[PDB]
Amino acid sequence: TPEMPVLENRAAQGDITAPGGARRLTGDQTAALRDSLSDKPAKNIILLIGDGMGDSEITAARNYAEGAGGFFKGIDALPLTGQYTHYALNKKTGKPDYVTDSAASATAWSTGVKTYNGALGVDIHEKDHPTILEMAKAAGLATGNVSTAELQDATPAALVAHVTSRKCYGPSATSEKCPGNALEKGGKGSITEQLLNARADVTLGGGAKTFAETATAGEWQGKTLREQAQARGYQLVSDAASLNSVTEANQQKPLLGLFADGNMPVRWLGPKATYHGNIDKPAVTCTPNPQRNDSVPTLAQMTDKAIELLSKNEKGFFLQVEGASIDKQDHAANPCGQIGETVDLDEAVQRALEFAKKEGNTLVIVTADHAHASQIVAPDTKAPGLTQALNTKDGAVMVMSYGNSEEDSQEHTGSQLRIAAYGPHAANVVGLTDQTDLFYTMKAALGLK
Amino acid sequence: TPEMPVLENRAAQGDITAPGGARRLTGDQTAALRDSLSDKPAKNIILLIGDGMGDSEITAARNYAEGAGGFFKGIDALPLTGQYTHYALNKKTGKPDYVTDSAASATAWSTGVKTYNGALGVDIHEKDHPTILEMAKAAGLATGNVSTAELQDATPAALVAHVTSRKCYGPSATSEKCPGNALEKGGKGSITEQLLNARADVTLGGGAKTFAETATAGEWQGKTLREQAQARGYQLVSDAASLNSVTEANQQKPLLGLFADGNMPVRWLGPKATYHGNIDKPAVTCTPNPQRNDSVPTLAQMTDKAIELLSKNEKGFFLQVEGASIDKQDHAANPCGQIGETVDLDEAVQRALEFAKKEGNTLVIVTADHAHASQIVAPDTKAPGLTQALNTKDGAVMVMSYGNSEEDSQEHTGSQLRIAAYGPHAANVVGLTDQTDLFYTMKAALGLK
Numbered sequence A, B: 001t002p003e004m005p006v007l008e009n010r011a012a013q014g015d016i017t018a019p020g021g022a023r024r025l026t027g028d029q030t031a032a033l034r035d036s037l038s039d040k041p042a043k044n045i046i047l048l049i050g051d052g053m054g055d056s057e058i059t060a061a062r063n064y065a066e067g068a069g070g071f072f073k074g075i076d077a078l079p080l081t082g083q084y085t086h087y088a089l090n091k092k093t094g095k096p097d098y099v100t101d102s103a104a105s106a107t108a109w110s111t112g113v114k115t116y117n118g119a120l121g122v123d124i125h126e127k128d129h130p131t132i133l134e135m136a137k138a139a140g141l142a143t144g145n146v147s148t149a150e151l152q153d154a155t156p157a158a159l160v161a162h163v164t165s166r167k168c169y170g171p172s173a174t175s176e177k178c179p180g181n182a183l184e185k186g187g188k189g190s191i192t193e194q195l196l197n198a199r200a201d202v203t204l205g206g207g208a209k210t211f212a213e214t215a216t217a218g219e220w221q222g223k224t225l226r227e228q229a230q231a232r233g234y235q236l237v238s239d240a241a242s243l244n245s246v247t248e249a250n251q252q253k254p255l256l257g258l259f260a261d262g263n264m265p266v267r268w269l270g271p272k273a274t275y276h277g278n279i280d281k282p283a284v285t286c287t288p289n290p291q292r293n294d295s296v297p298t299l300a301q302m303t304d305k306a307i308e309l310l311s312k313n314e315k316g317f318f319l320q321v322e323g324a325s326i327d328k329q330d331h332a333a334n335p336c337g338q339i340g341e342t343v344d345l346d347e348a349v350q351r352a353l354e355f356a357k358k359e360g361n362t363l364v365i366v367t368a369d370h371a372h373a374s375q376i377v378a379p380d381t382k383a384p385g386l387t388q389a390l391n392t393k394d395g396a397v398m399v400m401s402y403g404n405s406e407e408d409s410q411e412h413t414g415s416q417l418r419i420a421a422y423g424p425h426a427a428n429v430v431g432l433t434d435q436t437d438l439f440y441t442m443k444a445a446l447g448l449k
């Protein structure tokens, strides 16, 4: 009998100061890896994205929360790993633009085509390309889209919308920013409108604010997008109690969970990094956010409910889960927010892996859209940017640095980064790959045409 | 009949602006990965280290020299990849020190034990631990140590020396900095004296300057370390002609190649990055160093000759090859020097792979000791540090940033980084591992006790 193993434990095996104490392996891995290889078709796919979660963000998060010799039971447990490229294209020239934003990267793994920074679901010629979610739905599979960001944000929107600018959230921004996509100009509609038309079985996230807008044209002109949603049969839910109450989500009663106006709350708080903060200020210990809430579902809860609902479909399902705030907090130069959000994503990955290990036909993939700014530097570092000293689980201090922008927001970077997977077809993430190979790998694993 | 494949081509398959044109894969990878898995013993090991070559350095060098959609025929062709941690230990507390130097990291993979920054071949208690080279030689395998840095430098020294400070290059620095290791105090000697005692079959690099010092005690007291070398039967060689003339290197006539006084010359020139250099200055095109020479062997040449000489030993061989200046040029904030050194290492990795593919029992490993400073940022970036715009092979501009030090030297960083391998036992680099796991993997692969 054949089953696929998840690395149970890759923590340092003992005393890190002694010979062999810092090893993470206990014996040869060949047989274990041979057992992980399967070209059987995947019935399901769970894609987990940590926005801005390059290797440096994973390392910093692990150091702080599990200690240097620790191990994330979710993020570090996928057995097949590689590194992939995520460069975008300059719209005018069609040449590579080395540092992507969240919109062009999302489109690349969701459509299989490179695009310009800011586009959602269209190529450099502004032509629409079908997404993996739309194709899944067309083959009759259940579909889910979960995120801690506004649902109009680049990452979850890329699966359901095709607009020339990521800024075209609702009817008003669209009329002014994406005229050709404007409903009243004959277009498909703003991000939110196209989201409602896409009709995924399960959509959960923040972004309730934009649903307050009213349609400028169409069958539901004059009424709010929230009204249109209920009118078209959506089960609206807005707190954890209600979310747990849901027992079925399907094309007849698709679920829409709006848990916050903008982005859902961050798990941990901490002060922002400051100039010479590692020398001028005391070390920081992060504190849980008192307003994250008992009534606000966490990403792992959302992941669990999404899995429960989507698995009732005998055909199979595609679910994308996004740990959205790693990137946002990285932009904010806030180590605690950033680390808390990676820890949060780890819990959702654990849920996904438990299901997959038991179900056996599920491909789980964990990766990021692009790299980000934070760097782990020596404690006595005198850097030109923003730094902060943190008290880690090891009882030592780790210094983090943000030094790629004099502006207010720290920027993305173009380093290739880790992709890891488990399950049927995971072999296709090993070695060097491109972000658009992700679209083809998932399309082939599910056997879509 | 079973053979293990190297990735032949992972360059973008077509037009990067079109659907599927940016894909690096042409079909399912399962069978190919299954064919790469073997637990057969390794007769030989080739360990290639890019100093400071984290994923960011690899991406920057690929973008510049092969284009974003290109592919390093050496660096990117290894089929089994993972990420590994390299934290060092605080000497006093024994707790993790998140950002390692080159001395503690080389000690970790060459001994299997974590140590403090600055130590070579000793643990935090200053106890000596045998290296993979010393163990290989004890089992009767041929051994080689090749680098473009001074042979007294941390990376190549770690295989043959055990001193409490990496600064103890020769007799004089040792007397004052490593009193306990000083020969005239009864110690084993300075780095260069221990290198002469270790007697690897092939040692090639820079660092002839220190051999001008004279021993303070011992059998060869009063004469230069160069003189001692000839007295002990070493074949001294100092240019490429001489290097090519060598037809055998063994324990009777070990080879010592001193090609420069300090570090061997860098491949490419270019100006240093500067404050607001991507906005204030024109884009840079790197230029081949006129003084890199016809009489100075290149890293690939050194690698070839080392492989020819060490392969005559029927028992097998261990060879470590270091592209040293990637890290050094990264510190200097000089993109061209840094990229040129990465390109240079790629050529050496290609020679090692050709041999391995044909020999069939060689484990080739390519990785770095720690990550470094350089980041690939957006072209319009206003950063607080040093930046520079480069004209890449794609005909687009890529901006590189160094923003983690207000000092003169750019600093190392602690992000986990790529490790890739090919051949028998390569499965042990996949997933998350620690740098000390690498010592154990090599020892097992060669079957050492």
Ligand SMILES: [Mg+2]
Residues within 6 Å of the ligand: A051, A102, A149, A153, A154, A155, A156, A322, A324, A327
């Ligand atoms: Mg996002």
Ligand SMILES: [Mg+2]
Residues within 6 Å of the ligand: B051, B102, B149, B153, B154, B155, B156, B322, B324, B327
């Ligand atoms: Mg070095």
Ligand SMILES: [Zn+2]
Residues within 6 Å of the ligand: A051, A052, A101, A102, A103, A327, A369, A370
């Ligand atoms: Zn992003």
Ligand SMILES: [Zn+2]
Residues within 6 Å of the ligand: A052, A102, A327, A328, A331, A412
């Ligand atoms: Zn971002």
Ligand SMILES: [Zn+2]
Residues within 6 Å of the ligand: B051, B052, B101, B102, B103, B327, B369, B370
């Ligand atoms: Zn180094």
Ligand SMILES: [Zn+2]
Residues within 6 Å of the ligand: B052, B102, B327, B328, B331, B412
């Ligand atoms: Zn260095």
